[PDB]
Design a protein around this ligand. Sequence first.
Ligand code: HEM
Ligand code: M8N
Ligand code: CL
Length: 422
Amino acid sequence: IATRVNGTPPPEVPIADIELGSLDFWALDDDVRDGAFATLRREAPISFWPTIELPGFVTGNGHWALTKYDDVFYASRHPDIFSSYPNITINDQTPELAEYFGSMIVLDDPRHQRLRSIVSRAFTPKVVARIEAAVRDRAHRLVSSMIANNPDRQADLVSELAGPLPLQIICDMMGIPKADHQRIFHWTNVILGFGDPDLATDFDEFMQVSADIGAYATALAEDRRVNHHDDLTSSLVEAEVDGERLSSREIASFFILLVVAGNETTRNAITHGVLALSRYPEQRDRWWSDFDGLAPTAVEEIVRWASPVVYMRRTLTQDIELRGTKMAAGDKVSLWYCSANRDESKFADPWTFDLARNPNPHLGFGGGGAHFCLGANLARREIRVAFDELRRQMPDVVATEEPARLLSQFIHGIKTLPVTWS
Ligand code: HEM
Ligand SMILES: Cc1cc(CCC(C)C)ccc1NCNO
Ligand SMILES: [Cl-]
């Protein structure tokens, strides 16, 4: 595809053209989206928007959009005010889906910390360092297979590498048999792709997929309750929180959170990273000339640039005012990481994709504090190893078409990215 000029700011977007409540807005290209958030940061840093109407979802009240880095950081660090209960997407959750989506991410402390403590050891730096060889093995073989399977030197990066790598890693951590990885992939994509006609627009399919992955979780849990294995599902069924085992719905919700969180966002970080190296070849050249020296900053700049999670939602527990804006107890609040990560008052040259950027206190893993991404160290490893394997096996891998972008307010997804190599 065409490259662009690195450092170019987005087009001006008049504030009257911005409709965060319309699915059509989220189909526009990233230049327009980035320009819209730049206009909000400048002219309306806290503003109120209707909730997008999705067939079968509960619309409910609209939300206050926090677009400034400092406000997203403030909300994240004050959970006694900005609660993660009852949901962390904007749209209200049906009582039927609460059975499958009531994990620790929609809970406050103390119960959130008790739940997180069941699995946190498995994601600490020493424990993930052990997973590193498996990441290396899977990434090496996926890229080798891309080359063996495609003598025409053309393939889809998403289906051949970015998707399978994080999926295989988290499924093995969970104890899921390899035969079932494609069902997990499909379920993940329906749950986080709803509203995109290429994935699912029918709510019956969304509820069927939810029910099926919940039933799958429950059967695997029952098996592990009979026969322990060295995996996260056995951890879940063996835990006790003050002498009480987790309920079937708590187990199903934990399993679904871990599986979905563990593959989709990393997949999109890799695809956006390859697209950026394609658009800014100077950065590829710099990184390839010193891979290990630049990898720390390069991986962080890929996450800042991609912002794979566009926003997370909070709910006020009390009246507050910020920047002169009075917000009421019970109001929804949306935290726009995609905007915080272009905030001109926090980042020098925010429109420059600079793989040497340092410091880089981006909010791609959230604003910090109680819910800080459990998998951040694992994600950074998977990204660094995927790019090292591309450098080694197909260093000129480059996108040949513009991405097919996922239609989503929540996930900065790429459905397909055709690439070519020498
Ligand atoms: C580049 C990849 C990733 C990105 C951009 C990302 C982003 C995020 C964000 C924005 C949050 C919410 C943070 C907050 O509310 O303050 C989060 C939470 C979480 N992430 Fe990730 N994540 C990534 C990879 C992973 C991986 C590989 C896993 C492995 C399972 C994972 C597991 C989780 C979990 C379990 C939570 C909920 C934590 C809690 O509620 O305490 N994430 N992530
Ligand atoms: C994309 C996403 C969605 C959610 C809520 C949706 C359900 C499936 C838990 C939670 C975490 C993440 N990702 C975090 N880390 O990848
Ligand atoms: Cl103030």
